[PDB]
């Protein structure tokens, strides 16, 4: 038809992957499988894994920013109380 | 057309018609369905020494010809004679299965035979992609269950097989209660049964085989992707009928409705099959063929196909399964009638070829399971009696919204996921 730019994805039968040989896959009908009362007993000590790896990447930046926020806030509170109106005059303009 | 079966100490079955030659053989009621995962291929190995150069020369001197066949439910060892030598075939049978069944398993014979079934089963896996796929179909459809074992055995159970495994199998299955002696050709029943009751000696009579656990269909798939092969070969089936099912013939007729096809044969493109209107427009395949495979415990009903149209495999599968949907809801009188006529023709061409070795295998397998053979004319009575209502009731039980089993090899990237195939086993309704 109208031509076409070459891409990095094709379609079923010519996806653009490398030639596959030697790999054999197996599967079983959902119909033949245990109705979903399985997970648990086999899979709940399993997961809750992927966040043992991750929680530090989230928590430590979170901690840094929460600490930094709490500190600046408590300082602003002091500045606008009676006790701090002297420091307020100093740091303001 | 005859069926004379009578039991002395052994069970003797014959079917004679003045042809030319006569075939005599013993057919055991145990095949690859009786093996393990680990001695899988022992029956095929037995077959191959029975036909070894040593045993085969001893028969060719006497002017005898040797034939054997390993199946799932059964196993057969057959000698063809020239019909007055119907006695010298029984000599070769007993000289092998009593005398030489300790001389065939000589160290140099076994090692040269094992080396030959290894090149044999390897060649199969490397090159015979349609039968390779169909064998894997049984493997996944009937996984962890007797019907899953391949008849030729696997390369790994084969190369680890020893003389004692042959022995142990032969001592548990080559028994009297698991045997039938079969004669086809032109020789009479009383011509053979007397030559059998001539010599006595029972040999391991009273011994039963070993029992097991029943075969079961599991909806599943095995995908043997190989992008270097120039085609895709796929087989797809539901749980079909065992032999001695009420619907044995309804199933076989249903398969004849869609029949078989070859894109390069002009005549084949012209058959009265509605599916052909769909698949010929873009040439969705080089060939397909439907089957109703029946065994003792179960069977497979489905089709196999081969194609170079690797970007439209999903249309092949979709149009084929939409046709099968029709069997439950809209199959016509004249489709059923066309199938009756063609089922008779093909069932005829099977049961009455001009080759007695085929007759023996068909007789042997039948009498081992139901203790008798249904005559060709009796089948035609059953075939003609099938109504549209029968096919619909059958399809609604076996085809409609039922699990399937899939196997394929070659360029099958375009064969969609299981659930997509499985959803097409029915249609949306109000």
Swiss-Prot record, chain B:
Keywords: Electron transport, Membrane, Mitochondrion, Mitochondrion inner membrane, Respiratory chain, Transit peptide, Transport. It is a peripheral membrane protein. Its main location: mitochondrion. GO terms for molecular function: metal ion binding; metalloendopeptidase activity. GO terms for biological process: aerobic respiration; cellular respiration; mitochondrial electron transport, ubiquinol to cytochrome c; protein processing involved in protein targeting to mitochondrion; proton transmembrane transport. Pfam families: Peptidase_M16, Peptidase_M16_C. It is found in: Mitochondrion inner membrane. InterPro entries: Metalloenz_LuxS/M16, MPP/UQCRC_Complex, Pept_M16_N, Peptidase_M16_C. GO terms for cellular component: mitochondrial inner membrane; mitochondrion; respiratory chain complex III. Component of the ubiquinol-cytochrome c oxidoreductase (cytochrome b-c1 complex, complex III, CIII), a multisubunit enzyme composed of 10 subunits. The complex is composed of 3 respiratory subunits cytochrome b (COB), cytochrome c1 (CYT1) and Rieske protein (RIP1), 2 core protein subunits COR1 and QCR2, and 5 low-molecular weight protein subunits QCR6, QCR7, QCR8, QCR9 and QCR10. Component of the ubiquinol-cytochrome c oxidoreductase, a multisubunit transmembrane complex that is part of the mitochondrial electron transport chain which drives oxidative phosphorylation. Present with 19300 molecules/cell in log phase SD medium. Belongs to the peptidase M16 family. UQCRC1/QCR1 subfamily. This is Cytochrome b-c1 complex subunit 1, mitochondrial. The gene is COR1.
């Amino acid at each position: 038809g109208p031509p076409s730019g070459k891409t990095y994805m094709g379609w079923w039968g010519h996806m653009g992957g490398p030639k596959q040989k030697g790999i054999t896959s197996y599967a079983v009908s959902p119909y033949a499988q245990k109705p979903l009362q399985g997970i648990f007993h086999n899979a709940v000590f399993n997961s809750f894994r992927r966040f043992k790896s991750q929680f530090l990447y989230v928590l430590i930046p979170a901690g840094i920013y929460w600490y930094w926020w709490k500190n600046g806030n408590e300082y602003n509170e002091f500045l606008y109380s009676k006790a701090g109106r002297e420091e307020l005059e100093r740091v303001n303009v | 057309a005859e069926v004379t079966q009578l039991s002395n100490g052994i069970v003797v079955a014959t079917e004679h018609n003045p042809a030319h030659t006569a075939s005599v053989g013993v057919v055991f009621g145990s095949g690859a369905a009786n093996e393990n995962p680990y001695n899988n291929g022992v029956s095929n190995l037995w077959k191959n020494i029975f036909l070894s150069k040593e045993n085969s020369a001893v028969a060719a001197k006497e002017g005898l010809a040797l034939s054997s066949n390993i199946s799932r439910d059964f196993q057969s060892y057959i000698v063809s004679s020239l019909p007055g030598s119907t006695d010298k075939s029984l000599d070769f049978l007993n000289q092998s299965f009593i005398q030489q069944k300790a001389n065939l398993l000589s160290s140099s014979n076994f090692e040269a035979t094992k080396k030959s079934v290894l090149k044999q089963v390897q060649d199969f896996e490397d090159n015979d992609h349609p039968n390779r796929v169909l064998e894997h179909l049984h493997s996944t459809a009937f996984q962890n269950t007797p019907l899953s074992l391949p008849t030729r055995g696997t390369l790994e159970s084969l190369e680890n097989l020893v003389v004692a495994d042959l022995e142990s199998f032969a001592n548990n299955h080559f028994l009297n209660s698991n045997a039938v002696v079969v004669g086809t050709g032109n020789i009479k029943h009383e011509d053979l049964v007397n030559s059998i009751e001539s010599k006595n000696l029972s040999l391991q009579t009273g011994t039963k085989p070993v029992l097991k656990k029943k075969a079961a269909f599991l909806g599943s798939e095995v995908r043997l992707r190989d992008d270097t092969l120039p085609k895709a070969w796929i087989s797809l089936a539901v749980e079909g009928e065992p032999v001695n099912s009420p619907n044995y013939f309804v199933a076989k007729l249903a398969a004849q409705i869609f029949g078989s096809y070859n894109a390069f044969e002009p005549a084949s493109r012209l058959q009265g099959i509605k599916l052909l209107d769909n698949i010929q427009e873009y040439q969705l395949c080089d060939n397909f063929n439907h089957f109703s495979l029946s065994y003792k415990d179960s069977g497979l009903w489905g089709f196999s196909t081969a194609t170079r149209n690797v970007t439209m495999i999903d249309d092949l599968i979709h149009f084929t399964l939409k046709q099968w949907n029709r069997l439950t809801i809209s199959v016509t009188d004249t489709e059923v009638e066309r199938a009756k006529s063609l089922l008779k023709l093909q069932l005829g061409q099977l049961y009455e070829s001009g080759n007695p070795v085929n007759d023996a295998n068909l007789l042997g397998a039948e009498v081992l399971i139901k203790g008798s053979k249904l005559s060709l004319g009796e089948a035609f009575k059953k075939i003609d009696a099938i109504t549209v209502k029968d096919v619909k009731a059958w399809a609604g039980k076996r085809l409609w919204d039922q699990d399937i089993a899939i196997a394929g090899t070659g360029q099958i990237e375009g064969l969609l996921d299981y659930m997509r195939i499985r959803s097409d086993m029915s249609m949306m309704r109000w």
